[PDB]
């Protein structure tokens, strides 16, 4: 039912990646949470994800996105995930402007 | 089959809040409204948002997606409804421009 | 499978209507069409709908939505479409920037 | 599960057309390779779309992208593909800024 939706996280290898995350996850109760990040921690998600792209180059776009998926699925709470990786496109005539990987992971 | 889609209010607690709500109801008769917002007065849904919201600080961001979202479900006319409170991030490098929260509920 | 996306038609009563339609419809022959209007003539649609908004005031926001999306359906090779009616709201704080309704019709 | 987003791919035939395309894919292992276009490449995808629409004039829109769609489809490892070509519309008032088809197909 319930989702949080995190875009637009801009990390460098530099060459710009732009991340989103959606995260399907049943929200905490409000008896015990001070943030959203109590229920889900976009916070260490957003370094974790800068870490995984700064470190030794060993940088493929896919590879971004499915250590992504799988660092969120580490956490049993979530029910699904779904991370998209954009590499935004130095603006050449005939290319895409943009390419993008999107991974999926789900356990139910 | 019907829906109402209402984009882009933004409310403070300020901290800007910005909020989508969709209702899935059957619109009324052409012969007994005199606007939208007779077959759902988002108007008030509006105003409840904006007090819900500047309210005493106790303002989680997916407290107000669950209160608006009951709140549009008191109404036994809708069938589902789909909140989103979105809080547009200070732009700081390698974090999130944008963290929400998207809440569903449905009878059926 | 197949569908035609007609994004952003601006209508007046003015105030402003933003309009989309989205049809699914089998795509005619390349040996029988000059255009895509062939398959689909959203030329006419766009007169027909500026009509419908620029008639005698008695114009709500779903009554047009409705109508636009009865007369596609009566052309009988369109199996479903999706009619949004979006009027654009002045911008004053605590509303919704937009407000729409989203009609949709399919036989099978 | 996993896809391949290749968004704002601007051609000319001239009458500039947007194309964007999706592809449903099993990305390749890490271990074999060296970039994202080695599991899709789309590199040749966007020069083949170039070749399609630039082409002797007989430059249908659903015919680009019923084009497009089989080109990507001759490669058994894609599961589906969708493929939208967007006329954009000299901005003359009411008609639609933008008219697309969007092609898609699968195997299973």
Same mark, same amino acid.
């Given at each position: !039912?319930?989702?949080?939706?995190?875009?637009?996280?801009?990390?460098?290898?530099?060459?710009?990646?732009? +991340?989103?995350?959606? $995260?399907?996850? /049943?929200?905490?109760?409000? %008896?015990?949470?001070?943030?959203? !990040?109590?229920?889900?921690?976009?916070?260490?998600?957003?370094?974790? %994800? !800068?870490?995984?792209?700064?470190?030794? =180059?060993?940088?493929?776009? @896919?590879?971004?996105?499915?250590?992504?998926?799988?660092?969120?699925? /580490?956490?049993?709470? $979530?029910?699904?995930? @779904?991370?998209?990786?954009?590499? =935004?496109?130095? =603006? +050449? =005539?005939?290319?895409?402007? /943009?390419? %993008?990987?999107? +991974?999926?992971?789900?356990?139910?």
């Amino acid at each position: !039912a319930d989702r949080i939706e995190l875009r637009g996280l801009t990390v460098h290898g530099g060459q710009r990646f732009v +991340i989103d995350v959606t $995260v399907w996850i /049943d929200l905490a109760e409000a %008896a015990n949470s001070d943030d959203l !990040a109590d229920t889900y921690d976009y916070v260490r998600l957003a370094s974790r %994800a !800068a870490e995984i792209v700064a470190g030794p =180059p060993r940088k493929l776009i @896919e590879t971004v996105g499915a250590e992504i998926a799988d660092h969120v699925m /580490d956490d049993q709470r $979530v029910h699904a995930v @779904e991370v998209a990786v954009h590499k =935004p496109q130095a =603006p +050449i =005539p005939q290319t895409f402007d /943009d390419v %993008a990987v999107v +991974i999926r992971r789900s356990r139910r």
